[PDB]
UniProtKB/Swiss-Prot annotation, chain A:
A Gene Ontology biological process term: mitochondrial electron transport, NADH to ubiquinone
Any matching Pfam family: dNK
Location in or out of the cell: Mitochondrion matrix; Cytoplasm
Family matches, as SUPFAM superfamilies: P-loop containing nucleoside triphosphate hydrolases (SSF52540)
Subunit composition and interactions: Complex I is composed of 45 different subunits. This a component of the hydrophobic protein fraction. Forms a complex including sicily, ND-42 and Hsp83; the complex is necessary to chaperone ND-42 in the cytoplasm before mitochondrial import; the interaction between sicily and ND-42 is direct and occurs preferably between the unprocessed forms in the cytoplasm.
Cofactor: record remark: Binds 1 FAD per subunit.
Function: Accessory subunit of the mitochondrial membrane respiratory chain NADH dehydrogenase (Complex I), that is believed not to be involved in catalysis. Complex I functions in the transfer of electrons from NADH to the respiratory chain. The immediate electron acceptor for the enzyme is believed to be ubiquinone.
Listed cofactors: FAD
Summary of the tissues where the protein is detected: Expressed in muscles (at protein level).
Protein name (Swiss-Prot/TrEMBL): NADH dehydrogenase [ubiquinone] 1 alpha subcomplex subunit 10, mitochondrial
Domain of life of the source: Eukaryota
Annotated source species: Drosophila melanogaster
Keywords: Cytoplasm, Electron transport, FAD, Flavoprotein, Mitochondrion, Respiratory chain, Transit peptide, Transport
Curated annotation (Swiss-Prot), chain B:
The name this protein goes by in its record: NADH-ubiquinone oxidoreductase chain 6
Designated gene of the protein: mt:ND6
GO MF term (any one): NADH dehydrogenase (ubiquinone) activity
Organism expressing this protein natively: Drosophila melanogaster (Fruit fly)
Enzyme type, top EC level: translocase
A Pfam family hit: Oxidored_q3
Gene Ontology cellular component list: mitochondrial inner membrane; mitochondrion; respiratory chain complex I
Record membrane topology: Multi-pass membrane protein
Swiss-Prot record, chain G:
Organism of origin: Drosophila melanogaster
Keyword Lipoprotein annotated: no
Keywords: Cytoplasm, Electron transport, Membrane, Mitochondrion, Mitochondrion inner membrane, Respiratory chain, Transmembrane, Transmembrane helix, Transport
Lineage: Eukaryota, Metazoa, Ecdysozoa, Arthropoda, Hexapoda
The keyword Transmembrane belongs to this UniProt entry's keyword annotation: yes
The protein, known as: NADH dehydrogenase [ubiquinone] 1 alpha subcomplex subunit 3
Swiss-Prot record, chain I:
Protein name: NADH-ubiquinone oxidoreductase chain 3
Functional note: Core subunit of the mitochondrial membrane respiratory chain NADH dehydrogenase (Complex I) that is believed to belong to the minimal assembly required for catalysis. Complex I functions in the transfer of electrons from NADH to the respiratory chain. The immediate electron acceptor for the enzyme is believed to be ubiquinone.
Transmembrane segments annotated in the record for this chain: 4-24, 60-80, 86-106
Record gene name: mt:ND3
Subcellular location: Mitochondrion membrane
UniProt keyword list: Electron transport, Membrane, Mitochondrion, NAD, Respiratory chain, Translocase, Transmembrane, Transmembrane helix, Transport, Ubiquinone
Catalytic reactions on record: a ubiquinone + NADH + 5 H(+)(in) = a ubiquinol + NAD(+) + 4 H(+)(out)
Family the entry assigns: Belongs to the complex I subunit 3 family.
C-alpha cells in the first residue's frame, strides 16, 4: 500500500521474520512468539489475474518490487514432473502405460480432447491450492505481503470454460466441484485483486506475439474458448470476490505502466471497511484477539498437511479419472524407482547426498 | 399446621408444572415453588440462612432465563385447561382437608429445629449460623472451597470460549 | 490441545476432574468430580465451524446432566437409609446408582446417545470420549456389587455393540459401536477383578489411541476414503491396517493379550456361559473390522489418480509408527509384564 | 404367586411351574415391548399402544406355557424325566412361534433353536453346575494394595491395638 | 502341585478376605480422626 | 414406614422433575426450565440428609455452586446452538 | 510510562488497589501480631468452661487483669 | 465409607467432606464402628461389625425409634376408634415446656 | 417466619382490595376497538412485541449468574471469623477475593465485558 | 469496638451464672417426665402381642 516513495525507502519490518521454512510453529511455539506484532500496512495479499497471455508475470514482478511484496511465480506442471534433484519425470513415460502417460499444457493445446484433460485441470487446482497456502505462511510469519498471479479461487473458470467446449464430461465437472467445495472454504480470501481486461481480439493477437510453438500451432485458443473465459471471469469470479476483496480493472497494465498502478493502489483505503465488524469486505482477515491470529497462523504453518489431505474425495463412477489397478502397479514401479524418487528428498544417496548414517532431519511442511 | 399445607402446595404446583408448555408458564410455576421449598427447608433447620441463599441464587437464574425466553421463545401460547384447574383445585382442597384431620404430631419431621434441641446443648447458644458454616473455611475442608474457586473461574473461561462474543449478537433467526 | 492455550487448560482440568472422582472416599465427593469433568469436555467438544459439532455438544450435555442428577438422587437416598457410603447388602437403591453410571458411560441399554453423538466429533475428540471419559464411570461401578444388572449390560453390550456396527460406513460412528463392545468386556472384567480391568482398559485405550491417529493423521471419515487413500508402498498401507486385527484380538498380535487375560480369569471364576455369548459376539465385531481391511489386504486397487503424494504430520506419524510397531509385535513382551501374576 | 420352576421334581406342581415360566415370559415381553413402542413401531393413540404390548407379550406367554405343559406332559407319559423331554418341550414353543409369525419354517427351525436350548438347561440341572454362579474369586487389589498409598496428610495417632488387651 | 495349591489358597483368601494381599479393601479411618482433631482445635479457639 | 412419612414426598417430586426433562416440548429452553426444577428438589432431599447431621449444612453451598455452573454451561451451549442453527427447536436438529 | 496511563485512564483501580494493597499489609501485621500474643488462648470463653486443676489446659489459663 | 482404589494425594482434598465428628450425638458411635472397619478391612468388616453398624445406624438414621413412636400413636388411635378410649382422656398430661 | 407469613398474606389482601375498589370506583364507559389498541405514538404498529428481541449483553448475563454464586461464599465470612483459625480464614478469604479480581480484570482486558459490537 | 465488646462480655458473663441454675432445674424435671412416659407406655400397650 505504501510504496517505496511513500515510505521513502525499503520496508522496515516491525520484528524479525519467523524462520517459517525451517522451524515449525505449533501451539507451544505460539506462547512465546505472537503474530500480530509483525503486521504492517503492507501485510496483505494481492492476486494479479487476467486472461491468457496478458503479461501478468511481468506486471506482477514489477508491482511486487515497488510494494516490497513477495512475488510467487505461477504454478506449472514442471512442479510435478521435475523432482528436487532436477530429473525430468517425463522421460520415463515410454515405459508407463498409456493412461499414466505424462500430460502437460503442451499436450492440452495439442490433444485437448484426451481423457487426461480432466486430470490435468484438477492438478492445476491442487497446485494453486498448495502454493496459495504457502503464500499465507509467508504473510503470517514474516508480515510481508505477497503477490500471486492466479489464486485457486479463479481456477474453476478454466475448468468451466473447458467444459463448455466439451473437452470435459459431466462427471469430470461433478468431481471438480466436490473437490473445490471440499477444500476452498479453508483459505483466506485475498485483500486485493487486480484484473487486466484485454479484449478478446487483443489476446488472440497477443498470443501469436509470444510465438510459443505449441500455442500457435494449437486449435484450443479459439474465439469461442477465449470468449468463454472472459464471460466467466467477469460474471462469476470477479462479481463474487469483490464482495470480500478490493477490485481494480485495467485494460492491460502489462502493456501499460505499473508506477501509475501502484499509485492507484495506494489511493485505495483498507481501513474504512474495518469499522463495522460484520462487514463482508475483508471479513476473513478480521481477528479480534491475539489468539485468533495465532490460530490462523498455526492452521497454515502447522496444519497444511491436513489442508492437502482434503483432496481425498472417493469418486469412481467417473471412468476418466479412475486409474486401473494393473496400471497402478506398473506406474508405481517406474515412478518411484526413478533417480531421486527412491526416498524422500535429501536422502537419495545415488543422487549424491552424503552423511545419511548421521543424518536424521526432515524438512517441515515437506513431503512424506 | 402450615407444614402440611406446604406439603400440599408443593405437590399441587408440581402437578401443574408437569403440564406447562409455555416457557413463561413454566417459569411462573417454578418461581412460586422456589418460594415454598425455600420456606419449607428453613422449618427443619436451625436457621433460615440457607433459604435466603437459595432464594437469592435462584432469582439470579430466574431473570437470566427470561432474558433468553424473551429472545428465543417470545411468540408462544397459553391454554387454560379446565381439566387441570378442576383437578388441582379438587385435590388441593382434598389435601387441605386431610391436614386438618391429620395426627400432625406424627407428620412433623424428626429433624431437630433449634428449639427442638435440648437446653443443655451448650453449642446451641452461639450465633445462629456460627458452627454450621464454620468448617467451610477451616482446615482441611477449606481447600474444597478453594477448588470451587478455580472451578468457578475456570468456568468463567469456558463461557467466553463457548460463546464467541465477537461473531455477533443472538437472534432467533 | 490442538489450537490455543485455552485448549491446554480444559485438558488438564479434565484430568483433575477424573482424579477427584476416583480418589473420593464418599459418593458426594465422587459426584463433584463428575461435574468438574463435565464442563472440561464440552468446550473441547463444541466448535461453531460445524453445524454437527454443536449438536454433539448438546446430546452429551443433556445425557450427562441427567446421569449426574439421577446419580446424586440415589446417593442421597442410599445414605438416607443406611447412613453409610456403603450398603451392607445390595438392594434396589444400589441398582439405581448402577443404572446412572452405565448411562454415564453409554453401556448397552442406555448407549443410544453415544453413537448418535459421534457424527460431529473430530477424531481427537472421539479419543477423549472413547477412552478417558469411560474411566470415572466404570471405576465407580467397581464399588457396587450387583450381579444381574451388571450382567445384563454385558450381554446386551456385546450384542448391540456388534450388530449395530455392521450397518455403518462412517468410521467415527463405526468405532462407537466397536467401543461399545469393548465396553462390554470391561464390565465383564469388572465383576471379577479390577487389575484385569486396569490392564484390559490400558490395552483397549492403546489400540484405540492408535486407530484414532491413523484416521486423524490422514483425515479419513468414510469407508470409501480408505480405498481412495493413497500410499507410496502398498506394503506400508497393508501393514498399517494390520492393527485392526489386533483390535479384533487375534493372538498373533498384541491386541489379543488383553482378551486373553480376561478369559483366563473369567474361566477361573466359572463364568463359562458369559464367555460363550461374549467371545461368540466378538466375531461379528471382528467382521466389520475386516470390511476395513478390504482396502489393504487386497493390494492393487482402482484409485483416483490426481494424487501422487502423501502429505502427513511428522510428530503424530512419528508417534503413530512407534505405537503401531508394538501393536503387531507386542506379544513377545508379555514376558516382561509382571502385572498379571 | 412367587413360584420357582425347579422347586419340585420335573413331573410335579403344574400350577407352580406355569406361574414360574409365565413370569419370565411377561417380563421379557414388556422389556422388549417398551423399545418396540417407542423406538421402532411408534404407534399413535392410547389403544393401539396396548396392541404392541399384547402382540409382543401375548404369544411369548403362549410359548412358556406350551413348554411347561409339553415338558410336564412328556415327563409323565414317558415315565422318566430325561433330556428328550425338554427337547420335546422346545418344539412346542417353536410351533407357537410359527403360528405367531404365520410362517411354517420359522416355527419349525426356531423349535430346534429352542429345543437344544432346553436340553442344555436340563444338562445343568442334572449334572450340578450353574450358568451364572456367584464368583468364587473376587479380587479387590493388586499384590501391594495395602502398601501403595500416596496421601500427604499426616495420619494422627491410632486408637486400636493389635496386641492382646491389657486390664 | 504349586498351581493347584496356589489356586486353592487364593480361594480361601477370597472366601473370608482375611489377608492384606489381593482380596482386602483398605478401609481408612484416617480422615475422620483428622476431622475430630480439627474439631478439637476449633473448640479451644471459641471465645472472645 | 419412615421413608414413606418423611422421604416419599421429595422423591415423588423428583421423578416428576425427570418426566418434565423428557417430555416433548418444542423449545430447548423447556429442558433448561425443568433442569433447575430438578436441582431445586435435589437440594430439598440433600438438605434433609445434611440435617440428620447436627452441623454439616455447609455442604449446601458446594452443591449450589455446581448447580449454577451446569445451568450456566447449559445456557452457553444454547447460545452456541443459536449461532449455528438459528433456532433452538428440538425438531430442527438432525435426528441422529 | 505505565503508571501514568492507568492513573489517567482508570484512576479508581489505582486508588482502589492502593487501599487493597493496604489490606494485605496490615492484614500481615495483625495476623503475625495475633500469634505474637498467643491469641488462640482467649481470656473469655464462649460457654461454661471448667477445667480440672491437673488438666494440661489448666496450666495455660491466660492470666489478665480485667 | 467408600475406599478409593487410587488413593493419590487428591483423596486428602475431599476425604473430610461429610462426617459426624463435629459435635454430634453419634461421634463416638461412629468412631468405634469405622475403626473396626479399619482393623478388619472393608469386606471382612461388614461381617464383624454387626453391633457397631446397627448401633450407629440406630443413632443417626433413628428408624428404630421413630418406628417405635408410630406404634404408640397408632395404638393410641386404634384404641379410641374402637371405643376403648374416651374423648376426655385421650392424651396423657403434656410434659413441661422447660424440659428435654 | 409464621408471623411474617401471616402479615405477608394480610398485606396482599389489603393491596388486592385497593384495585378491587378501583375497578368499581372507576368510571365505566363502552370499550372501543381503538381505545384498547396498543400505544405506539398514535400510528398503528408494524411489529408485534412478541418478535425475537435481539440481545447484546448475553455474555454479561451469564457472568451475572456466576458472580452471584460466589456471593454465597463471601457472605458467611463475618459469621465465622470469631470461631475459625485465623491463618486459614485469612489466607482463604484473600485468595478468594484475588481470584475474583483476577477473573474480572482478565475478562475486562480481553474485552468480554464490552457489549457485542 | 472496645465498648461493644465490653458490653457483650458483661452480657455473656451473666449467662454463666444463670446457665448452671437452669440445668439443675431441667434435670430434676427431665427425669420425672421419663418415669411418666415409661408408665404411660406400659398402660397404653398392655395387650400388644
Ligand atoms: C487490551 C488488550 C491489550 C493487548 C493484549 C494484552 C497485552 C498485555 C499482556 C498481558 C499478559 C497476556 C494476557 C493474555 O493475552 O491472555 C493470555 C493469552 C491467551 O488468552 P486466552 O483468551 O486464550 O485465555 C487464556 C486462558 N488461560 C489464562 C487459562 C491460559 O496468552 C496465553 O495464555 C499465554 C501467553 C501469555 C503471554 C502473552 C503476552
Ligand atoms: C423463565 C424465567 C421467567 C421469570 C418470570 C416468571 C413470571 C412470568 C409470568 C408471566 C405471565 C404468565 C401467564 O401468562 O399466565 C397467565 C395466567 C393465566 O394462564 P392462561 O393460560 O389462562 O392465559 C391465557 C388465557 N387465554 C386462554 C384466554 C388466552 O394468569 C395468571 O394468573 C398469571 C399471574 C401473574 C402475576 C404477575 C407475576 C409477577 C411476579 C413478581 C415476582 C414475584 C412476587
Ligand atoms: C450351537 C449353538 C449352541 C452352542 C452350545 C451353547 C451351550 C454352551 C454350554 C452352556 C454354557 C457353559 C456351561 C458350563 O458352565 O459348563 C461347565 C461344566 C461344569 O463344570 P464345573 O466347572 O465343575 O462347574 C462348576 C462347579 N460345579 O464344565 C464345562 O463345560 C467346562 C468346559 C468348558 C465348557 C465350555 C462350553 C461352551 C462351549 C460353547 C460352544 C459354542 C458353539 C461353537 C460351535
Ligand atoms: C457344542 C454344542 C453341544 C450341544 C449338545 C451338548 C449335549 C450333548 C447331548 C447329551 C445327551 O445326553 O444326548 C443324548 C440324550 C439322551 O439321553 P435321554 O434324555 O436320557 O434319552 C434317551 C435315554 N433314555 O438326548 C439328548 O440330550 C438330546 C440331544 C439332542 C441334540 C441335538 C443337537
Ligand atoms: C433359548 C432361550 C431361553 C431363554 C431362557 C429360559 C429361562 O428363562 O430358563 C430359566 C428359567 C428359570 O429357571 P431357574 O433355574 O429355576 O431360575 C429361576 C431363578 N429365579 O426358566 C425355567 O424354569 C427353565 C425351564 C427350561 C427353559 C428351557 C428354554 C429353552
Ligand atoms: C425362537 C425365539 C422365541 C422367542 C424367545 C423365547 C425366549 C424368551 C425368554 C424370555 C425370558 C428371559 C429371561 C429368563 C430369566 C431366567 C433367570 C435368569 O436370569 O437366568 C438364569 C437362568 C438360571 O439361573 P442359574 O444361573 O443357572 O442358577 C440356577 C437358578 N435356579 O439361566 C438359565 O436358566 C438359562 C437357560 C438357557 C440356557 C441355554 C444354553 C444352551 C444354548 C443353546 C443355543
Ligand atoms: C450534600 C449531599 C450531596 C449528596 C450527593 C449524592 C450524589 C448521588 C449521585 C451520585 C451518582 C453520580 C453519577 C455517578 O454515578 O458517577 C459515578 C462515578 C463517576 O465516575 P466515572 O463515570 O467512572 O468516570 C468516567 C468513567 N469513564 O463513578 C466513579 O468512578 C466513582 C469511583 C469511586 C472510587 C473511589 C475510590 C476511593 C479510594 C480512596 C483512597 C484514595 C486516596 C489515595 C489512595 C490511598 C491508598 C492508601
Ligand atoms: C398461598 C401460599 C401462602 C404461603 C405464603 C407465601 C408467601 C410468602 C411470603 C412470606 C415470605 C417471607 C418469609 O416467610 O420469610 C421467612 C424467613 C424469615 O426468617 P428469619 O430470618 O428468621 O426472620 C423471621 C422474622 N420474624 O425468610 C425467608 O425464608 C426468605 C423469605 C424471602 C421472601 C421474599 C419475598 C416473597 C414475597 C411473596 C412472593 C409471592
Ligand atoms: C497499575 C495497573 C496498570 C494497568 C494498565 C492499564 C492501562 C489502561 C487501562 C485501560 O482501560 O485502557 C484500555 C484497555 C483496553 O481494553 P478493552 O478491551 O478495550 O476493554 C475496555 C477497557 N476500558 O483496558 C484494558 O485492557 C484493561 C482494563 C483493566 C485493567 C485493570 C488492571 C488493574 C491491575 C491492578
Ligand atoms: N487448461 C488450463 N490451462 C491454463 C490454466 N492456467 C493457465 N493455463 C494455460 C493456458 C495457456 O495455454 C497458458 C497461458 O499461460 P499464462 O496465461 O499463465 O501466461 P504466463 O503466466 O506464462 O505469462 P503472462 O501471462 O504473459 O504474464 O497456460 C488452467 O487453469 N487450466
Amino acid at each position: 500500500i505504501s510504496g517505496k516513495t511513500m515510505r521513502g525507502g525499503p520496508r522496515v519490518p516491525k520484528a524479525a521474520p519467523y524462520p517459517y521454512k525451517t522451524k515449525k510453529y505449533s501451539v507451544f511455539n505460539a506462547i512465546f512468539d505472537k503474530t500480530s506484532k509483525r503486521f504492517d500496512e503492507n501485510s496483505k495479499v494481492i492476486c494479479v489475474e487476467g486472461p491468457i497471455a496478458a503479461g501478468k508475470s511481468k506486471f506482477a514482478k514489477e508491482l511486487a518490487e515497488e510494494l516490497d511484496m513477495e512475488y510467487y511465480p505461477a504454478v506449472d506442471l514442471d512442479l510435478i514432473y521435475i523432482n528436487s534433484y532436477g530429473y525430468d519425470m517425463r522421460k520415463l513415460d515410454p515405459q508407463l502405460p498409456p493412461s499414466c502417460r505424462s500430460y502437460d499444457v503442451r499436450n492440452f493445446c495439442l490433444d485437448p480432447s484426451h481423457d487426461l484433460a480432466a486430470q490435468f485441470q484438477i492438478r492445476m487446482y491442487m497446485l494453486r491450492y498448495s502454493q496459495y497456502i504457502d503464500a499465507l505462511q509467508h504473510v503470517l510469519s514474516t508480515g510481508q505481503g505477497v503477490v500471486l498471479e492466479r489464486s485457486p479461487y479463479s481456477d474453476f473458470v478454466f475448468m468451466e470454460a473447458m467444459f463448455r467446449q466439451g473437452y470435459l464430461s459431466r462427471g469430470a465437472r461433478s468431481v471438480y466441484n466436490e473437490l473445490r467445495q471440499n477444500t476452498i472454504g479453508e483459505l483466506l480470501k485475498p485483500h486485493l485483486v487486480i484484473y487486466l481486461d484485454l479484449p478478446v481480439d487483443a489476446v488472440k493477437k497477443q498470443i501469436k506475439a509470444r510465438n510459443v510453438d505449441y500455442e500457435v500451432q494449437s486449435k484450443v485458443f479459439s474465439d469461442a474458448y477465449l470468449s468463454d473465459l472472459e464471460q466467466l471471469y467477469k460474471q462469476q469470479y470477479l462479481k463474487d470476490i469483490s464482495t470480500h476483496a478490493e477490485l481494480l480493472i485495467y485494460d492491460w497494465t502489462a502493456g501499460g505502466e505499473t508506477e501509475v498502478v501502484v499509485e492507484d493502489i495506494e489511493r485505495i483505503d483498507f481501513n474504512q471497511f474495518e469499522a463495522d465488524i460484520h462487514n463482508k469486505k475483508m471479513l476473513d482477515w478480521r481477528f479480534p484477539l491475539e489468539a485468533e491470529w495465532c490460530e490462523a497462523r498455526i492452521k497454515y504453518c502447522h496444519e497444511k498437511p491436513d489442508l492437502m489431505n482434503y483432496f481425498n474425495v472417493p469418486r469412481f463412477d467417473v471412468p476418466e479419472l479412475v486409474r486401473s489397478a494393473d496400471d497402478g502397479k506398473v506406474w508405481r514401479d517406474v515412478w518411484f524407482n526413478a533417480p531421486g524418487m527412491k526416498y524422500r528428498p535429501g536422502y537419495n544417496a545415488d543422487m549424491g547426498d552424503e552423511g545419511l548414517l548421521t543424518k536424521t532431519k526432515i524438512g517441515i511442511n515437506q513431503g512424506i | 399446621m402450615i407444614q402440611l399445607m406446604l406439603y400440599s402446595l408443593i405437590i399441587t404446583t408440581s402437578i401443574i408444572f408437569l403440564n406447562m408448555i409455555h416457557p413463561l408458564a413454566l417459569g411462573l410455576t417454578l418461581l412460586i415453588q422456589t418460594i415454598f421449598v425455600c420456606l419449607l427447608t428453613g422449618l427443619m433447620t436451625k436457621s433460615f440462612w440457607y433459604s435466603y441463599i437459595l432464594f437469592l441464587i435462584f432469582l439470579g437464574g430466574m431473570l437470566v432465563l427470561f432474558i433468553y425466553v424473551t429472545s428465543l421463545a417470545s411468540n408462544e401460547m397459553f391454554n387454560l385447561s379446565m381439566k387441570l384447574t378442576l383437578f388441582s383445585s379438587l385435590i388441593l382442597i382434598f389435601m387441605l382437608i386431610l391436614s386438618f384431620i391429620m395426627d400432625k404430631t406424627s407428620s412433623s419431621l424428626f429433624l431437630m429445629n433449634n428449639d427442638m434441641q435440648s437446653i443443655i446443648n451448650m453449642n446451641s447458644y452461639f450465633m445462629e449460623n456460627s458452627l454450621s458454616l464454620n468448617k467451610l473455611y477451616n482446615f482441611p475442608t477449606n481447600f474444597i472451597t478453594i477448588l470451587l474457586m478455580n472451578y468457578l473461574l475456570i468456568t468463567l473461561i469456558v463461557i467466553v470460549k463457548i460463546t464467541k462474543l465477537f461473531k455477533g449478537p443472538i437472534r432467533m433467526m | 490441545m490442538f489450537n490455543n492455550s485455552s485448549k491446554i487448560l480444559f485438558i488438564t482440568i479434565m484430568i483433575i476432574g477424573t482424579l477427584i472422582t476416583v480418589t473420593s472416599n464418599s459418593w458426594l465427593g465422587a459426584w463433584m468430580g463428575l461435574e468438574i469433568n463435565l464442563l472440561s469436555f464440552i468446550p473441547l467438544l463444541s466448535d461453531n465451524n460445524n453445524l454437527m459439532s454443536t449438536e454433539a455438544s448438546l446430546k452429551y450435555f443433556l445425557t450427562q446432566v441427567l446421569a449426574s442428577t439421577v446419580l446424586l438422587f440415589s446417593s442421597i437416598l442410599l445414605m438416607l437409609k443406611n447412613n453409610m457410603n456403603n450398603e451392607i447388602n445390595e438392594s434396589f437403591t444400589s441398582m439405581i446408582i448402577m443404572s446412572a453410571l452405565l448411562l454415564k458411560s453409554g453401556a448397552a441399554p442406555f448407549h443410544f446417545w453415544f453413537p448418535n453423538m459421534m457424527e460431529g466429533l473430530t477424531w481427537m475428540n472421539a479419543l477423549m470420549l472413547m477412552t478417558w471419559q469411560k474411566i470415572a464411570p466404570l471405576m465407580l461401578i467397581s464399588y457396587l456389587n450387583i450381579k444381574y444388572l451388571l450382567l445384563i449390560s454385558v450381554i446386551l453390550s456385546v450384542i448391540i455393540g456388534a450388530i449395530g456396527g455392521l450397518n455403518q460406513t462412517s468410521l467415527r460412528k463405526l468405532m462407537a459401536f466397536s467401543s461399545i463392545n469393548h465396553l462390554g468386556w470391561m464390565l465383564s472384567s469388572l465383576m471379577i477383578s479390577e487389575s484385569i480391568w486396569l490392564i484390559y482398559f490400558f490395552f483397549y485405550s492403546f489400540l484405540s489411541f492408535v486407530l484414532t491417529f491413523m484416521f486423524n493423521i490422514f483425515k479419513l471419515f468414510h469407508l470409501n476414503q480408505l480405498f481412495s487413500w493413497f500410499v507410496n508402498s502398498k506394503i506400508l498401507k497393508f501393514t498399517l491396517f494390520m492393527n485392526f486385527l489386533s483390535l479384533g484380538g487375534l493372538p498373533p498380535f498384541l491386541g489379543f493379550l488383553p482378551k486373553w487375560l480376561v478369559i483366563q480369569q473369567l474361566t477361573l471364576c466359572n463364568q463359562y456361559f458369559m464367555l460363550t455369548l461374549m467371545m461368540m459376539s466378538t466375531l461379528i465385531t471382528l467382521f466389520f473390522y475386516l470390511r476395513i481391511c478390504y482396502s489393504a489386504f487386497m493390494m492393487n486397487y482402482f484409485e483416483n489418480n490426481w494424487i501422487m503424494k502423501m502429505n502427513m504430520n511428522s510428530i503424530n506419524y512419528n508417534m503413530y509408527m512407534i505405537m503401531t510397531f508394538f501393536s503387531i509385535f507386542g506379544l513377545f513382551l508379555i514376558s516382561l509384564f509382571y502385572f498379571m501374576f | 404367586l412367587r413360584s420357582k420352576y425347579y422347586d419340585h421334581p420335573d413331573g410335579e406342581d403344574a400350577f407352580g411351574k406355569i406361574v414360574a415360566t409365565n413370569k419370565y415370559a411377561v417380563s421379557a415381553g414388556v422389556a422388549w415391548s417398551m423399545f418396540d413402542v417407542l423406538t421402532l413401531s411408534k404407534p399413535q393413540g392410547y389403544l393401539p399402544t396396548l396392541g404392541r404390548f399384547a402382540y409382543n407379550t401375548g404369544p411369548l406367554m403362549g410359548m412358556a406355557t406350551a413348554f411347561t405343559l409339553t415338558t410336564l406332559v412328556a415327563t409323565n407319559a414317558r415315565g422318566k424325566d430325561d433330556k428328550i423331554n425338554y427337547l420335546i418341550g422346545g418344539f412346542a414353543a417353536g410351533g407357537v412361534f410359527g403360528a405367531w409369525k404365520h410362517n411354517h419354517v420359522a416355527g419349525l427351525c426356531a423349535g430346534l433353536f429352542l429345543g437344544i436350548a432346553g436340553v442344555i438347561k436340563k444338562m445343568s440341572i442334572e449334572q450340578g453346575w450353574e450358568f451364572f454362579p456367584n464368583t468364587p474369586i473376587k479380587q479387590y487389589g493388586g499384590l501391594n494394595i495395602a502398601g501403595n498409598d500416596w496421601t500427604i496428610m499426616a495420619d494422627p495417632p491410632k486408637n486400636w491395638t493389635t496386641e492382646k488387651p491389657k486390664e | 502341585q504349586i498351581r493347584l495349591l496356589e489356586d486353592e489358597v487364593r480361594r480361601k483368601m477370597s472366601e473370608r478376605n482375611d489377608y492384606q494381599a489381593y482380596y482386602y479393601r483398605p478401609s481408612v479411618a484416617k480422615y475422620h480422626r483428622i476431622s475430630k482433631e480439627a474439631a478439637d482445635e476449633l473448640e479451644a479457639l471459641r471465645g472472645d | 414406614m419412615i421413608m414413606i412419612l418423611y422421604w416419599s414426598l421429595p422423591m415423588i417430586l423428583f421423578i416428576l422433575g425427570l418426566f418434565c426433562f423428557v417430555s416433548n416440548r418444542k423449545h430447548l429452553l423447556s429442558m433448561l426450565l425443568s433442569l433447575e426444577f430438578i436441582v431445586l428438589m435435589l437440594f430439598f432431599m440433600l438438605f434433609i440428609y445434611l440435617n440428620m447431621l447436627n452441623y454439616e449444612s455447609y455442604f449446601s453451598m458446594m452443591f449450589l455452586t455446581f448447580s449454577v455452573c451446569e445451568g450456566a454451561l447449559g445456557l452457553s451451549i444454547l447460545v452456541s446452538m443459536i449461532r449455528t442453527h438459528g433456532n433452538d427447536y428440538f425438531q430442527s436438529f438432525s435426528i441422529m | 510510562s505505565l503508571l501514568k496511563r492507568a492513573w489517567n485512564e482508570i484512576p479508581d483501580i489505582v486508588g482502589g488497589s492502593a487501599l487493597a494493597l493496604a489490606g494485605i499489609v496490615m492484614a500481615t501485621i495483625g495476623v503475625a501480631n495475633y500469634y505474637a500474643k498467643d491469641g488462640d488462648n482467649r481470656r473469655y470463653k464462649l460457654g461454661y468452661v471448667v477445667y480440672r486443676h491437673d488438666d494440661p489446659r489448666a496450666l495455660k489459663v491466660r492470666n489478665d487483669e480485667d | 465409607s467408600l475406599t478409593p482404589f487410587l488413593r493419590l494425594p487428591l483423596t486428602d482434598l475431599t476425604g473430610c467432606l461429610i462426617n459426624h465428628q463435629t459435635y454430634d450425638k453419634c461421634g463416638k458411635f461412629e468412631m468405634k464402628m469405622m475403626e473396626c472397619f479399619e482393623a478388619y478391612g472393608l469386606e471382612r468388616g461388614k461381617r464383624e461389625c454387626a453391633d457397631l453398624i446397627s448401633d450407629f445406624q440406630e443413632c443417626v438414621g433413628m428408624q428404630k425409634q421413630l418406628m417405635r413412636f408410630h406404634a404408640m400413636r397408632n395404638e393410641r388411635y386404634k384404641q379410641w376408634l374402637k371405643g376403648e378410649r374416651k374423648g376426655q382422656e385421650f392424651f396423657a398430661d403434656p410434659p413441661r415446656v422447660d424440659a428435654y | 417466619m409464621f408471623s411474617i407469613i401471616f402479615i405477608a398474606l394480610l398485606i396482599l389482601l389489603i393491596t388486592t382490595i385497593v384495585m378491587f375498589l378501583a375497578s368499581i370506583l372507576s368510571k365505566k364507559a363502552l370499550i372501543d376497538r381503538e381505545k384498547s389498541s396498543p400505544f405506539e405514538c398514535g400510528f398503528d404498529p408494524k411489529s408485534s412485541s412478541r418478535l425475537p428481541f435481539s440481545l447484546r449483553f448475553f455474555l454479561i448475563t451469564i457472568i451475572f449468574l456466576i458472580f452471584d454464586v460466589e456471593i454465597a461464599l463471601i457472605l458467611p465470612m463475618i459469621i465465622i471469623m470469631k470461631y475459625s483459625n485465623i491463618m486459614i480464614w485469612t489466607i482463604t478469604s484473600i485468595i478468594f477475593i484475588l481470584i475474583l479480581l483476577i477473573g474480572l480484570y482478565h475478562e475486562w482486558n480481553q474485552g468480554m465485558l464490552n457489549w457485542s459490537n | 469496638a472496645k465498648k461493644v465488646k465490653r458490653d457483650e462480655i458483661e452480657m455473656r458473663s451473666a449467662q454463666n451464672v444463670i446457665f448452671p441454675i437452669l440445668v439443675a432445674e431441667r434435670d430434676r424435671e427431665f427425669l420425672r417426665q421419663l418415669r411418666r412416659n415409661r408408665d404411660e407406655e406400659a398402660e397404653l400397650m398392655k395387650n400388644v402381642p
